[PDB]
Amino acid sequence: EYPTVSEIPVGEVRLYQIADGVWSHIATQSFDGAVYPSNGLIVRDGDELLLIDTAWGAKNTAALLAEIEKQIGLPVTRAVSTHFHDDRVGGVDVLRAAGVATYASPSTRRLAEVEGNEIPTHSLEGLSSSGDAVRFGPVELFYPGAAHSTDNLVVYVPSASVLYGGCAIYELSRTSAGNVADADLAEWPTSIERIQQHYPEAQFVIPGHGLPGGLDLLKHTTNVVKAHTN
Ligand SMILES: O=c1cc(CP(=O)(O)O)c2c(F)cc(F)cc2o1
Ligand SMILES: [Zn+2]
Ligand SMILES: [Zn+2]
Ligand SMILES: [Zn+2]
């Protein structure tokens, strides 16, 4: 019942209710003749919504906003990008044009600027050191340390026991690392262990791409990263 690539054309977005007041958004993007799905998160905050990550591009992100307005009907007042790559910040300009306040760590903002990517407007404080956590509306933001990228953040929704790992956490069906050009392979398993230590009660774990599961997605990602290292 989780949407797959065969069921979403590039340009369209699906929403999937994970728990009360928590959704993932699913879009697709083409790259080198392959089509990949990509996840982000939506968290209700009273009568408004917190968005986690763009839908990987301007067109997808415009469709994401339209699908949120149609299905949920609450305003997206803030958005957090969890690292500087295009599947997390691609579409920030669309969000900003729609009146969404876009946020990222100062680390992410700097890496986005170096990359020539779109740059979230606001800077998130309190996330500079591995193990740092801050409350942000209905979620906790956690910097586990370098993994998929040096700046990657994860997001926890305490009310729903939902852990969003972003691209630092792989789905079970992904058995090879793939693209790790900006990764810290040496630190990635240590950063995953910080996530496991901080969120042992998580019931749902959402990877950056593909199917949700439980906490065994953390050990899975460590296994894949260590195999790639060797
Ligand atoms: O599932 C993915 C998703 C992405 C984006 P990211 O690496 O930031 O998650 C991706 C990519 F951009 C290039 C590639 F060659 C493979 C990829 O595989
Ligand atoms: Zn990335
Ligand atoms: Zn990704
Ligand atoms: Zn595995």
Q: Is there a contact between 221 and 192 (Cβ–Cβ < 8 Å)?
A: yes
- Is 220 annotated to bind ligand? yes
Which residues partner with 207 through β-bridges?
Answer: 166
Catalytic pick among 39, 53, 60, 85: 85
Report how far residue 137's alpha carbon sits from residue 94's, in angstroms, rounded to the nearest whole number. 22
Catalytic pick among 83, 117, 151, 152: 83
Number of CB atoms found within 10 A of residue 198's CB: 17
The b-or-e profile of 200-217 (16+ CB within 10 A means b, else e) is eebebbbbbbbebbebeb
Backbone angles phi and psi of 36, in degrees to 5:
-120, 145
Both structure tokens of 157: 């929704």
Report how far residue 24's alpha carbon sits from residue 136's, in angstroms, rounded to the nearest whole number. 18
- The closest alpha carbon to 151, from 185, 177, 179, 184, belongs to 184
Report how far residue 190's alpha carbon sits from residue 222's, in angstroms, rounded to the nearest whole number. 9
| Catalytic (active site) residue 85 | yes
Both structure tokens of 82: 């969890």
Which residues partner with 79 through β-bridges?
Answer: 51, 102
Count of domains observed in the chain: 1
| Catalytic (active site) residue 86 | no
Which residue range is the domain that position 34 belongs to? 1-230
Task: Give residues after which the chain gaps, C-N over 2.5 angstroms.
Answer: none
Both structure tokens of 194: 């910080």
Report how far residue 133's alpha carbon sits from residue 135's, in angstroms, rounded to the nearest whole number. 7
Q: Is there a contact between 38 and 64 (Cβ–Cβ < 8 Å)?
A: no
Distance, CA 230 to ligand 4 centroid (Å)?
Answer: 16
The beta-strand segments (E) located in the chain are 14-19, 22-31, 34-45, 48-52, 76-80, 101-104, 122-123, 132-136, 139-143, 154-157, 162-166, 204-207
